[PDB]
Structure formats: C-alpha cells, structure tokens
Amino acid sequence: TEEQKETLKKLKLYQKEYYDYESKFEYELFLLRQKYHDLYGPIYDKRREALVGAKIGTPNLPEFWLRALRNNNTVSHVIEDHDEEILVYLNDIRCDYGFILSFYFATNPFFSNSVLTKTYHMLHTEATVIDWYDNKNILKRDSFFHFFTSHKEVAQLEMIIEGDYEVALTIKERIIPYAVDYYLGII
Amino acid sequence: TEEQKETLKKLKLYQKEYYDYESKFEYELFLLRQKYHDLYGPIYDKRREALVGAKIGTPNLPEFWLRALRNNNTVSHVIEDHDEEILVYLNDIRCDYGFILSFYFATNPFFSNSVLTKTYHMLHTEATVIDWYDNKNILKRDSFFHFFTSHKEVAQLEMIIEGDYEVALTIKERIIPYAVDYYLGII
Secondary structure (H helix, E strand, C coil): HHHHHHHHHHHHHHHHHHHHHHHHHHHHHHHHHHHHHHHHHHHHHHHHHHHHCCCCCCCCCCCCCHHHHHHHHHHHHHCCCHHHHHHCCCCEEEECEEEEEEEEEEECCCCCCEEEEEEEEECCCCCCCCCCCCCCCCCCCCHHHHHHHCCCCHHHHHHHHHHHHHHHHHHHHHHHHHHHHCCCCCC | CCHHHHHCCCCHEEEEEEEHHHHHHHHHHHHHHHHHHHHHHHHHHHHHHHCCCCCCCEEEEECHHHHHHHHCHHHHCCCCCHHHHHCCCCEEEECCCCCEEEEECCCCCCECCCCCEEEEECCCEEECCEEECCCCCCCCCCCHHHHCCCCCCCCHHHHHHHHHHHHHHHHHHHHHHHHHHHHHHCC
16 A cells, blocks of 8 residues: 555655664774774784794794694694694794685694685685695594695595584684683693 | 794794784774664664654654565564564664664554663573563563573474574664665565
C-alpha cells in the first residue's frame, strides 16, 4: 500500500544516512589504527636494536623469540622439539599491513633465507619457500615451518587455513605486541 | 648474565612504553565508538518514529521486525512458526551500552510486558522474565523467547551461552544497524 510505501522510502533514506556515518566511522577507524601502527613501529625497532645488537639469533638475550613463542598456548602447539634449533636463530618478527608477517633469521645451517615472510590477503596466503640446505630439511614429520605454504570433504582446506590463520593472528596480535611478557612467562 | 639483564631492563622499558600507547589507543577507540553510537541514535529513533507512528507492532509497515529477523541466517534458526504471531507485535528493537538489548512490544494477547530487555555483562546475562497471560505460554517446545533466560559435561553451559550470545550479537550488530535491508531481503 502507498502509505506503507511512503514509510519504506523514509526507512531507505535513514538507512543511506546510516551508511554515511558507518563510512566516516571506518575511515576514522583506519586513521586511528594507522596512527598507532606508526607509534608502535619505533618501539619494535628499539626492542630489535637491543636484542640483535652475529651467527646466533638475538645475541644480547639468546633464545628470545623461541621462549616468547614457547610460552604461548596457541603457538606452542605447532612448535616441535626439532624446530627449536632453528628458531634460536630468529632475530626479529615483524608485521606490516591484509598483513605480511616477517621472520628475520641470522645465518644458520638450515636455510639461506634471511627473511621468511608470510602474506595474508584479506582469500589467499603467500609464504616464501624455505631454502633448505642439503640434509637439513626438518620437514623430513610435523614442523612449525609447515607454516610457510601458500593456499587459497573440503574440510581439509578449511582446517589447514583455520589453524594456520589462528597462529598468524596470535603472532600478529599477541606475540609481536607483548613479546617480552611471554618470554618472562608472565602472560 | 648482567649484560643480558641490561638488555632485559631495556625490553621491559619499551614494553611499558608500548602499554602506554595501547592505553591511549583503546581510549581513543572508546571515544570513537561512543561518538558514533550517538550519531546512530537519532536515525534509529527516526526509523522508530516512522514505523510505530495502536495494538499491532510497526503499524505503518506491518510485520517489519519479523521479516527483518526472518531474513537473517543466524536468527531465523531460533524463530519458530509459533513465535511469529507474537513478533508481529514488536514495535522496536534497541541497544544501549557490555550492552542491553531491548525489545519493545505493542500490547498483545501474550504478555503484559511492554519491554523485554536482555543484559549481557562482559560473565552473566540478565533477561526480564516474560509475563505470559493464562493459556498463552508458547514455551509450552522451542521458541525464540527462550532467549529471555538468565545465566552465568559443562558443555551444555557453554553451548547455550554460545548460541544465545551469537544471536545477541547479530541483533546488536547486524539487525539493528541494517534492519530495513534484511526486511527487503537484500542482505
């Protein structure tokens, strides 16, 4: 009916209006997040300066990122005993804007890579293929480093992308912000 | 070692510093959310003015909130055929700051309540007990209105609070913001 139709025009009007504000919101929200990503930036670098100061990772406080990781519930699960002698070489873990997780390694017997990146587009993931040296491929079993695969009855294709994504977020949001607190065992 | 200890002091220092910024963040984040809750406010009222203009809900566009709800995947599940003749009496759904969901009803044959609220503390939920009139208690089976319970092998005590909380969020965040779009069947 036309009277109902007149109501509905008004309701569409108020809903567009709504969308205008939700727009300004998300915009003001992007702004706030970027503002603070750049405020964190410097602190992460200071931490990195301090630790990395060499052919062992984080020489000024050996095994840093390892214990940090070990002391996280979600991440500890994926980290096997045989991964540990590689992770001790980890210099820094960084995150850039979805996002690209970067793992910086000191020179090691295991691979030539100085950086293992993992990109999550937010859809598909892009991780750099590891440069395993001869007889040094620990994947030969389960390993934290199976993390560095690219992806896009199908339950196997969710679960892998479900648990691998859950790890990425932890690292992105728990480990990177509060690294030393995990290391201390105080979270 | 003392040299490692000096590193660790620095790392605690930079982590406090971090916490200072995450503080300012969340504060600037509260601000932004409140700013916009108050910007939405007026639009929700206009929508409510328009619809509610009576002994049937939303008289200027009958069955509004019902179709809005029906057209939501998550919520439609909990809404049974026998609930519908009550929901047609729903005038408005509002949300105040965790949060308190409010369902405003036109006078109906089913209960005396003009408002059924549900509070989620964010822990425990507090919903108002319905004032079922004699021989009008549709709970006597499953009903959307089982939603109006208070809560705090234990898998039953999560699942109930898990699915009931999922509904609340939808209503809070999907239905309330985009009500007319669900109604239209365009989301």
